[PDB]
């Protein structure tokens, strides 16, 4: 599990459940090709997105569908979605945990990188 | 204006208005003595808390009554309040801006010292 | 000034100066077309990106070149950049302030719409 | 484990290790009496602070010694520490996860409350 995503809800003090997450990898032609996708679990986490073998060096984009999440709660959010773009494995294989804390008009994201 | 406080609402995407703010200075006996207080304006800001002469080196605590703010909106918040404790260094011309971004179960605070 | 961007540095407790910001508007063919760009000032702010007349309803993307900012400080950041994608509603007099707080491996962004 | 604290480092993209945490409970005389304390582990977490039986309703304060953490890294931080004050178990026993994301001049804290 080299790539993990965790999403929390700052309004309800709970994990953000059933949040759609799409991951893309920048292709040779500078285009974003689908890499993996999923929905956060009851704990606000998304595991099994990829494997060490498939997760090669490159630029990846993790898109979190925050809009659909807030609309389902009856809240009109500011952002269309939350995006996290980063170069991965440039100096060897690493484990990445992408965390996002969501509010209707704000979000924070941090990364925890392990060897 | 050596010290300024700004509070934003992350739920409504607006300044946090009429939020009570209390500032304290740590006294010689390690006790918190009232220093200044006020309520954020329409722009979520609070100015004129103190002056350069009065704002001497020391440890200060800025307490933001976040609980009352959320209750007024019909939301049961997690925190009793938000506190920011810092040491005013004074070493060189410095203005302190304490910013807080509020959500019912979360808050972030940052300091901009220029 | 319908749209304003403010960037702060959470590591140095100061405004993030000379940060490149690019704004795009989603075109009819679902493509991002350049809309406006600039660099944050000494106060970490970027004004005069657009006008009320030009800033019509639509989906906009604000891209903050955070990577170049950290590299200039000798720090290897995590993100390639920070992006804020939002729909300008226009329904009623509204000014948009996009604020970003930057750290090497984290950033927070909030919108203050008044 | 009704009370858990997790601390992350936003500057290094890693858990904040060996961070001292002190917990207090507001006493009848409006005084803060020591309740529990510990240091974050290699994963930035602190477990076993208290038990369901001991964690009764009341106002608690979780103090995270962020200053010592940054000084050990050679960084002069803004805050003396980070404090989280909340009423707990007022409507029955709950599980609380207090998370903090640290930067020299900024910190964010969120709570995840479970039944
Ligand atoms: C991944 C981890 C978890 O949920 O256990 C986690 C997730 C989010 C935060 C976090 C807390 C406050 C502001 C920004 C991020 C954090 F400090 C730790």
Q: Residue C11 to residues A99, A112, B2: CA-CA distances in angstroms?
A: 19, 17, 21
- E strands, D1-115, where? 3-9, 14-15, 20-26, 32-39, 45-46, 58-64, 79-88, 95-103, 106-114
Contact A33, A61 (CB under 8 A): no
**Nearest CA distance, D104 vs chain A (angstrom):** 15
Contact B35, B5 (CB under 8 A): no
- Candidate from D4, D8, D84 with most ligand 1 atoms within 8 A of CB, to mutate: D8
Enumerate the residues of chain C whose CB falls inside 8 A of the CB of residue A94: none
- Touching D: which chains, 3+ CB pairs < 8 A? A, B, C
Question: Considering only CA atoms, which of C61, B3, B45, B103 is closest in space to residue A83?
Answer: C61
- Residue written as token pair 């000032």: C41
Rounded Cα distance between D64 and D24, Å, is 12
Computed on alpha carbons and rounded to an integer, the radius of gyration of chain C in Å comes to 14
Dihedral, CA of residue C31, residue C35, residue C41 and residue C44, to nearest 10:
-50
Rounded Cα distance between A13 and A100, Å, is 13
Mutate to test the interface with C, among B87, B99, B112 (most CBs of C within 10 A): B112
Q: Domain containing A111: what range?
A: 1-115
Q: Kindly report the backbone phi and psi dihedral angles of residue B71, in degrees, each rounded to the nearest multiple of 5, phi listed first.
A: -60, -35
CATH number at residue A68: 2.60.40.180
Contact D105 C78 (CB under 8 A): no
Question: Considering only CA atoms, which of C97, C104, C3 is closest in space to residue C48?
Answer: C3
The number of distinct structural domains making up chain B is 1
Contact C111 B15 (CB under 8 A): no
Name D64's Cβ contacts closer than 8 Å, sequence gap at least 6. Answer: D5, D7, D19, D20, D21, D81, D82, D83, D84, D100
Chain B with chain C: Cβ pairs closer than 8 A: 33
Experimental technique: X-ray
Contact D3, D24 (CB under 8 A): no
Environment class of B91 (CB within 10 Å of its CB; exposed 0-12, middle 13-18, buried 19+): exposed
Count Cβ atoms below 10 Å from residue C1 Cβ, excluding itself: 13
DSSP B68: H
Helix ranges restricted to H, C5-111? 66-72
Enumerate the residues of chain C whose CB falls inside 8 A of the CB of residue B44: 112
Resolution limit, Å: 1.9
């Amino acid at each position: 599990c080299p790539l993990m995503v965790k999403v929390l809800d700052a309004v309800r003090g709970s994990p953000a459940i059933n949040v759609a997450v799409h991951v893309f990898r920048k292709a040779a032609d500078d285009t974003w090709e689908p890499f993996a996708s999923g929905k956060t679990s009851e704990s606000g986490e998304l595991h099994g997105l990829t494997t060490e073998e498939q997760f090669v060096e490159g630029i990846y984009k993790v898109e979190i569908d925050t809009k659909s999440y807030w609309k389902a709660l009856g809240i009109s959010p500011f952002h269309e979605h939350a995006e996290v773009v980063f170069t991965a494995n440039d100096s060897g294989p690493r484990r990445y945990t992408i965390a996002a804390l969501l509010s209707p008009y704000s979000y924070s994201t941090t990364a925890v990188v392990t060897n």
